[PDB]
Amino acid sequence: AKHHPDLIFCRKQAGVAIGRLCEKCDGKCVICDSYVRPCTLVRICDECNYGSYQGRCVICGGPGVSDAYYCKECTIQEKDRDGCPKIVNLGSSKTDLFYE
Amino acid sequence: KEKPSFELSGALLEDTNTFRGVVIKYSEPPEARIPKKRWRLYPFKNDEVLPVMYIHRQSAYLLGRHRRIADIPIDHPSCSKQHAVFQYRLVEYTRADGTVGRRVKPYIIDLGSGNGTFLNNKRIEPQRYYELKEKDVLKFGFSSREYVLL
Amino acid sequence: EYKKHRRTMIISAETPRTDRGGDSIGETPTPGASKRKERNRPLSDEELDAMFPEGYKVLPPPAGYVPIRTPARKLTATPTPLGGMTGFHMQTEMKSVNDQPSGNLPFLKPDDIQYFDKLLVDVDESEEQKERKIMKLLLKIKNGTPPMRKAALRQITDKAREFGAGPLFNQILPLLMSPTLEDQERHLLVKVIDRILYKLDDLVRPYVHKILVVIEPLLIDEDYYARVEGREIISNLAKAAGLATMISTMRPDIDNMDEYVRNTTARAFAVVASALGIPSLLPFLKAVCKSKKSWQARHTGIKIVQQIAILMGCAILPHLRSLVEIIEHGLVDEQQKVRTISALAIAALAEAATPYGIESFDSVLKPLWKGIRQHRGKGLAAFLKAIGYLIPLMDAEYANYYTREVMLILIREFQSPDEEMKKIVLKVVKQCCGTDGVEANYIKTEILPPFFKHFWQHRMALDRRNYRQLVDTTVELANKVGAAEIISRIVDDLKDEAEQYRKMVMETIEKIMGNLGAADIDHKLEEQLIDGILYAFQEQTTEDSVMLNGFGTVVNALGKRVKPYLPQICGTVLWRLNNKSAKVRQQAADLISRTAVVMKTCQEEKLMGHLGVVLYEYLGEEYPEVLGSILGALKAIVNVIGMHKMTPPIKDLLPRLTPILKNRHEKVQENCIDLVGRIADRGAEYVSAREWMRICFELLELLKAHKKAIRRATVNTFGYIAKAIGPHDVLATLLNNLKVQERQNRVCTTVAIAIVAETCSPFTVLPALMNEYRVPELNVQNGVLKSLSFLFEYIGEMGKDYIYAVTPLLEDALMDRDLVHRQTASAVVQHMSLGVYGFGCEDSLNHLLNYVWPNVFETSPHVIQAVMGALEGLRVAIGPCRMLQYCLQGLFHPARKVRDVYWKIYNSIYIGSQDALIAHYPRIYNDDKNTYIRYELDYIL
Amino acid sequence: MTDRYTIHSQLEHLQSKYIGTGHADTTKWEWLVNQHRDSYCSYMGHFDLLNYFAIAENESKARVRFNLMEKMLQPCGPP
Amino acid sequence: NPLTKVKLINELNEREVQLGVADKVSWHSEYKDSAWIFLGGLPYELTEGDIICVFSQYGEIVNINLVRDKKTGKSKGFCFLCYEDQRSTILAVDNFNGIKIKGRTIRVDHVSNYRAPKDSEE
Amino acid sequence: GGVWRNTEDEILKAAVMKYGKNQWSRIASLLHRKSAKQCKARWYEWLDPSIKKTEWSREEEEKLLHLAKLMPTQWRTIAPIIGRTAAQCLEHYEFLLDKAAQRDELEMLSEARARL
Amino acid sequence: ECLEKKVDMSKVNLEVIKPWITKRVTEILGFEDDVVIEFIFNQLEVKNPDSKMMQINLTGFLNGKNAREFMGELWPLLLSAQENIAGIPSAFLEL
Amino acid sequence: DTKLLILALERLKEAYSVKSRLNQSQREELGLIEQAYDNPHEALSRIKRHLLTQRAFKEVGIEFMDLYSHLVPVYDVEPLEKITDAYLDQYLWYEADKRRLFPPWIKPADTE
Amino acid sequence: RLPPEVNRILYIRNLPYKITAEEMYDIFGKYGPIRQIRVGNTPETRGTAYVVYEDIFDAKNACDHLSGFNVCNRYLVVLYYNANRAFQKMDTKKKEEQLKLLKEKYGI
RNA sequence: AUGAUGUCAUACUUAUCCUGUCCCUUUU
């Protein structure tokens, strides 16, 4: 996105697990990364939500509280009918901040 | 078939004093200290003091017939590996003035040799605080020796 | 002491294996000799030439000093016993030395000299020696200022293809191998290894093992982030190199004497198998576990099966059958380890085996159950682990019998001192007794008394894993046998001395009353409850949520059964609300915050008077960490009792809040801004406008916050008060900012311009903004461009009009003064383009697309991705046909650049709306070998 | 049988997985065959377009559908 | 797993020392009223007299008994010894836990259940 | 710190020409990189208009060579006397001149040394 | 090369190919290992194996020059076993 | 070396910061002090390089204080120069007492 | 009673280009018998040397007393030399003959 | 008179981000 250009999404097969968002990343969109116009809910992959991988945020990856949703600008642009956008990789973000 | 004994095992004693390739016996007490008196080992095997070893610079000194345990070998075939151990330690004694204090003096005690030892043509028994001084005619072997130290 | 064998690892196929055979044979020679009878073993001149690097001589001096060195041993005893001493004379008295010789050259630790000595000498400017010499940019990465580390890091990234992997790793692996290595320095060298391994692909093949030897110790580590990094870089290495490279590389470490390398090597195969997939690597494994040489191998390979189970986890599912078919042959093996680790690996499998593939484990069972009878010690517990994870996967009929058999041993084995044991049998009790096909009364009688006897003790709780797992198991037993039982037995322990134990039973009660509900609880036990919870809460050694969330959940679960207990509660709440200054104030405050609703619905109004004015009084507290909790409590009190009923009428409260905003720190800033938000949104009439506009001019600099949520609440509030007043003044006060501060929140003011433009119709506001683009100051020009962007993003449909107004200005902006204009303006075109869709304004969007179109070419990431979003929105709004009519000629153009880009675009147009493209592909004539005319469209009735 | 050609991966990038997107180095015949296959798929998917195509010709709907499915592989001759 | 028990006991003692626990809840209320401590992981060349001499630094042991196995010298590696008071057992579990004695390290913990012949893990 | 870039040096020269010389706090409020003492030291070291930054001759070298032996320390005292007055060009010239030119019984003895 | 003809391991035996593969592995790698025998067992376990994948797996393990000759010797013996109606190579008819 | 540097920096900190006052010069002094207490070997490197190299000095500060009987003027120095000179001073006194160079005549020292 | 990272090899620097191996052997020969010593004869490595002793504790007493020890005008850089790094220039081989010997002579 | 590589400051963007830990390495 915005917060991270080197991050890669999962884009796996869509399952029946509804996605969730963390308390620090509440209200933020997954594709458009906006805060207004939520139109479609976020669905997670089957391998992305299993055991300890269930109930986690898609973007933040932390403890999810509320369910995540997609932006209406991404819904009208057909950017929400793609695969599961689970953040798998984590590069150049929250790595040197742990040392300080 | 069982026979547990709960006695003193050798491994706990060997782990406390562990040498390079053998066990280490004849440990000094806690009252050992570095000597500051004017004393040097003058060895005369053929009335000529070729070598000279400082006894106040080192804390431990082991001489034997083995090259792996000892640091420097010795040319004495009639002496065992553990025959005599001359170590300096400040023991409880009185000076000439009568005041008590710490005096650096050498300790003389037999370590249980197989043939014993002799000093100034006289055998000395262990566990007896003998007045050891400089220029003593000692023997560094179990039976006899052709070399004396001063 | 186990891990420090790392320090003994020297740096780095038939020859490779030939070496291990000789290594083990020398081990048998030496080991044998002692029976026949370390690093100090004497050495040989070839071995001597082996250690030191290139360019040194072993030339001696005279023929009378080497004999001194030989007598030195004998004379180390002899001459130490001889005359010697040193002295000094008083006499009057050149001093050379070297720090790092360079323009700056950030400093060298006294040890690192050994590595970087070559840099110290100043000889310069006369091939490879100059590449090693210039490669000391490493030193700039290791030690120096952060900017030096950044710039150095890039410079070495782009020189990868140049220098090659050989010199780099040759000059790195010693450093990453250094005994004095830091935490940070380690991590940074890991970073450079990654970044260079994103490029080098075929090159690394000789160095792969030479890498892994240092890296595999990262997999076993106390730090977690170190582990995820390690797994990542081994993933990049294995995928980077070839499969056969990895395989053929890593064999000799399987039979290596030390088990350390075997283990970490197993996790290595786990990572590489995640990289290149299970089926590719299967025949290797399946070959390994059947190796007839020695057991250690099979032990390793089985451990590999396990670590694959942990790593891949849920994704094992397809090959589960083949994997089982591999592992099954080790359960019956004569060696023990292989059996143990085997069944353990079955466990890991089944645990990653989500409710399915039961029959794949099928043939495994019948031996296991049999083994359950005859085993003593750890292997037994391991089997219990496996069977434990299995049982949820069986049928409640077969698992009825089998379960009822397991329960016996499960009972008998509670009492073992082994903590591994207790972990296993614990989680077991969870799965076996958390089965729907198990009867309550049987558990109530047989299990619970020994369970609370042996398991609940102060050995457990002090440990971490045992703590958690215990919590879970107890929670589930509550889930079956019911609530009042478990709680009723563990209440008396709330009053126990130690903290951690109290914490444990407290969180247990919390989760229990969370799930089952408080309805089951009787009266007396409820008295013991509330008293227990107060008592435990009155002594807090550390600050933590467990006690608080615990209390809150207990009360909210009890509902209004708690009402008789309030005066005791809140009495404690006020008295504690003094006592501890910095420690407990914040905590009692938060207690109020979470108990608000309960103190409301039961209609105790005196208590709301109390909390209202009492808390009102603490707003002068100088300690921020307290004050924050105070404001939070006020917040929660606002959400229960309404505006006009506030016992501290808002006229009092709000201006008393206003000065606090200088607090800066989020602790007071967070809750404060929040509350100003709640009141500013809800009532908002109680306060006169003058106060409000002052609040504005105070809010303006809150945008320096380092936290995102602060700015969040801030902007939303600013919208609320924008409603309370009306647009023009406040949007002017936003335009007062020239966006000089690029740090903290700047564009945030832009967002305020957006939301303000929403709160009352932007149909009013736009002319002011559009006029304010005139100002010659550039950064605020791009600022108002952003304001348009977010503006259309929030307004959506309503832009069906204002498009025209913004159109010529976008013309001026999109026509480039400087790149940021084109970028931001393009984003505006995007959000406009999504917003207006389908309403028939496309024409002017085409006009703007003209000026958009030249910007297609550039290497700047933000402008190219911006333009991409732009042309995507323009795709959906205009329709593909026009897009494609701009994208045709660029596809086949001779240059590489144009083709790269126009094909990127054409792909973006292609993926979406691929169905609607059909009509618009032009007519393309047919050549000799191929017919390029689609004649179907030319069929005419 | 040394081939020295292992199109496996590099740095988890590119790796085309879709069909009909195309590249910058795409030939004219491959793009024409992909456009013809997309046109055949759009004719087979749309019911009104298939009805308008079968009403003009004297063939039936299922025969024209089988002819369009048979002409998909080699519908214009791979370049 | 074989040597992780002493590490787990040391981690529990470190967590009890760092969590701010008093003397009443310092992992002693669950192993109270019993001076019988469980020792496991000893060397195969250690006798009962040497273990009784090494474990007498914190007080005189009342009843010590080594795990008898392999009819030749009764050697299995485990040992059970009851001290005089519970404070001596607490000091032995707090000081002699995880220490090294003649090569391989041993483990010191409390059982406080009964006297059983086969209760440790080899 | 104190990198003394050229764009900062021009701004410091403009602040010295516009504001004044005996007002160091007024010149430090328009640079955002150095303090007032560092700005005054830069103005007295490199930004001074009377500093002779070039033309090293043999008369000044002979003056500095005939002054470093009379006073070995206190190079700041010989800064304005030699004429350089930069307090660092004198030490650099001394280092260049040192590197380029490098490339009772006792009395009884001497008494008999003349009598023999 | 010789790895372009399609073959099938279901029409050929497996016990007669173990000694020739063991001799080829002892000639190539010098000694006898357990990873190469397991790789040869996994390469013939499928009913329709891949000659190019087996050649890549042999070039990754061995040097490549001897691995190409080993693949060319294993493809011809498998072809002679699959072409025969019995399902055995030419080295099994004599002994 | 390091033991002497810690002692001298402790004295310099205890004097220059006591309680809740500042400047901007004193702020840079406290900051360099904290950086020295964070990366001590680098600071010892800095001090050694300065003491062997830089034979110059920056402009020191002075304004007298008035114990109104006899005024006794008190001089102030620039920060990093003060730190380096302070480690030099504690070094000089350490080697002086180890050498017993100043006699027992000049008796102002560590009896009381 | 020793840190593990120290090894029998010591990297020694701040050496003159004229320095003699006589002074080398003499000085360093205090602590124990020399396994051997190398000296850089190459343009970059001139001024550096590596010392190797029959025992580690030798080297420990060495770096103890020889820390910042003086020669000519110089204070030598005395560090414990690292391991691994650049090794594989040589190989693992020639184990077969010696192992065959110990398998022959003692017969074990 | 553009453009080229190059050591070196300076602004700008990413609504970039400040409580992250071993709740999993337990390898002889």
From Swiss-Prot, chain A:
Where does it sit, as one GO cellular component term? U2-type spliceosomal complex
Q: Which InterPro entries match?
A: PHF5
Query: What's one GO BP annotation on this UniProt entry?
Result: U2-type prespliceosome assembly
**Residues with the Phosphoserine modification:** S93
Residues annotated as binding Zn(2+) 2 are C22, C25, C57, C60
Sites annotated Interaction with RNA: Y99
Q: Which UniProt keywords apply?
A: Acetylation, Activator, DNA-binding, Metal-binding, mRNA processing, mRNA splicing, Nucleus, Phosphoprotein, RNA-binding, Spliceosome, Transcription, Transcription regulation, Zinc
Where this protein primarily resides, as one coarse class? nucleus
N6-acetyllysine-modified residues are where?
A: K2
Q: Where in the cell is it found?
A: Nucleus; Nucleus speckle
The GO terms describing molecular function are: DNA binding; RNA binding; zinc ion binding
Q: Where, in this chain's numbering, is Zn(2+) 1 bound?
A: C10, C45, C48, C84
Region listing for Interaction with SF3B1 and SF3B3, in residue ranges: 34-50
Task: Write the signal peptide boundaries.
Answer: none
Where do the annotations place Zn(2+) 3 binding? Answer: C29, C32, C71, C74
User: Modified residue N-acetylalanine is at which positions?
Assistant: A1
> What is its quaternary makeup?
Component of the 17S U2 SnRNP complex, a ribonucleoprotein complex that contains small nuclear RNA (snRNA) U2 and a number of specific proteins. Part of the SF3B subcomplex of the 17S U2 SnRNP complex. SF3B associates with the splicing subcomplex SF3A and a 12S RNA unit to form the U2 small nuclear ribonucleoproteins complex (U2 snRNP). Within the SF3B complex interacts directly with SF3B1 and SF3B3. Component of the minor spliceosome, which splices U12-type introns. Within this complex, interacts with CRIPT. Interacts (via N-terminus) with U2AF1 and SRSF5; acts to bridge the two.
The name on file for this protein is: PHD finger-like domain-containing protein 5A
Q: What species is this protein from?
A: Homo sapiens (Human)
Q: What is the lineage of its organism?
A: Eukaryota, Metazoa, Chordata, Craniata, Vertebrata
UniProtKB/Swiss-Prot annotation, chain C:
Name its cellular compartments.
Answer: Nucleus; Nucleus speckle
- Residues with the modification Phosphothreonine, per the entry, are T8, T15, T28, T30, T70, T78, T80
Superkingdom assignment: Eukaryota
Q: Where is this site: Interaction with SF3B3?
A: K239, C314, E842
Give the principal location in a single coarse category: nucleus
Q: Which GO terms describe its biological process?
A: chromatin remodeling; mRNA splicing, via spliceosome; positive regulation of transcription by RNA polymerase I; positive regulation of transcription by RNA polymerase II; positive regulation of transcription by RNA polymerase III; RNA splicing; RNA splicing, via transesterification reactions; spliceosomal complex assembly
| Gene Ontology MF term list | mRNA binding; RNA binding; splicing factor binding
Pinpoint the site Interaction with PHF5A: E229
Subunit architecture: Component of the 17S U2 SnRNP complex, a ribonucleoprotein complex that contains small nuclear RNA (snRNA) U2 and a number of specific proteins. Part of the SF3B subcomplex of the 17S U2 SnRNP complex. SF3B associates with the splicing subcomplex SF3A and a 12S RNA unit to form the U2 small nuclear ribonucleoproteins complex (U2 snRNP). Within the SF3B complex, interacts directly (via HEAT domain) with SF3B3, SF3B5, SF3B6 and (via HEAT domain) with PHF5A. The SF3B subcomplex interacts with U2AF2. Identified in the spliceosome C complex.
Instruction: Give the family this protein belongs to, as stated in its UniProt record.
Output: Belongs to the SF3B1 family.
What protein is this chain from?
A: Splicing factor 3B subunit 1
UniProtKB/Swiss-Prot annotation, chain D:
A Pfam family reported for this protein in Swiss-Prot or TrEMBL = SF3b10
* Residues the UniProt record annotates as site (Interaction with RNA): Y5, G20
Positions of the region Interaction with SF3B1 and SF3B3? Answer: 15-76
Q: Which residues carry this modification: Phosphoserine?
A: S9
Q: Name one GO biological process term.
A: regulation of DNA repair
Q: Which residues carry this modification: N-acetylthreonine?
A: T2
Q: Which UniProt keywords apply?
A: Acetylation, mRNA processing, mRNA splicing, Nucleus, Phosphoprotein, RNA-binding, Spliceosome
Q: Which InterPro entries match?
A: SF3b5/RDS3-10, Splicing_factor_3B_subunit_5
- Cellular component, GO annotation: nucleoplasm; nucleus; precatalytic spliceosome; SAGA complex; spliceosomal complex; U12-type spliceosomal complex; U2 snRNP; U2-type precatalytic spliceosome
Keyword Phosphoprotein in the entry? The reply is yes
Q: Which residues carry this modification: N6-acetyllysine?
A: K17
Where, subcellularly, is it found?
A: Nucleus
**Any GO MF annotation of the entry:** RNA binding
* UniProt KW RNA-binding keyword: yes
| Disulfide links within the chain | none
Q: Which family is this protein grouped under?
A: Belongs to the SF3B5 family.
**Stated role:** Component of the 17S U2 SnRNP complex of the spliceosome, a large ribonucleoprotein complex that removes introns from transcribed pre-mRNAs. The 17S U2 SnRNP complex (1) directly participates in early spliceosome assembly and (2) mediates recognition of the intron branch site during pre-mRNA splicing by promoting the selection of the pre-mRNA branch-site adenosine, the nucleophile for the first step of splicing.
Q: What is this protein called?
A: Splicing factor 3B subunit 5
Give the species: Homo sapiens (Human)
Curated annotation (Swiss-Prot), chain E:
- Where in the numbering of this chain does the RRM domain appear? 35-113
Subcellular localization: Nucleus
- Superkingdom, natural source: Eukaryota
Locate the cross-link: Glycyl lysine isopeptide (Lys-Gly) (interchain with G-Cter in SUMO2).
K7
Q: What's the stated role of this polypeptide?
A: Involved in pre-mRNA splicing as component of the activated spliceosome. As a component of the minor spliceosome, involved in the splicing of U12-type introns in pre-mRNAs.
Family label: Belongs to the IST3 family.
Subunit: Part of the activated spliceosome B/catalytic step 1 spliceosome, one of the forms of the spliceosome which has a well-formed active site but still cannot catalyze the branching reaction and is composed of at least 52 proteins, the U2, U5 and U6 snRNAs and the pre-mRNA. Component of the minor spliceosome, which splices U12-type introns.
Protein name, per record: RNA-binding motif protein, X-linked 2
Q: Which part of the complete protein is shown?
A: 2 to 123 of 322
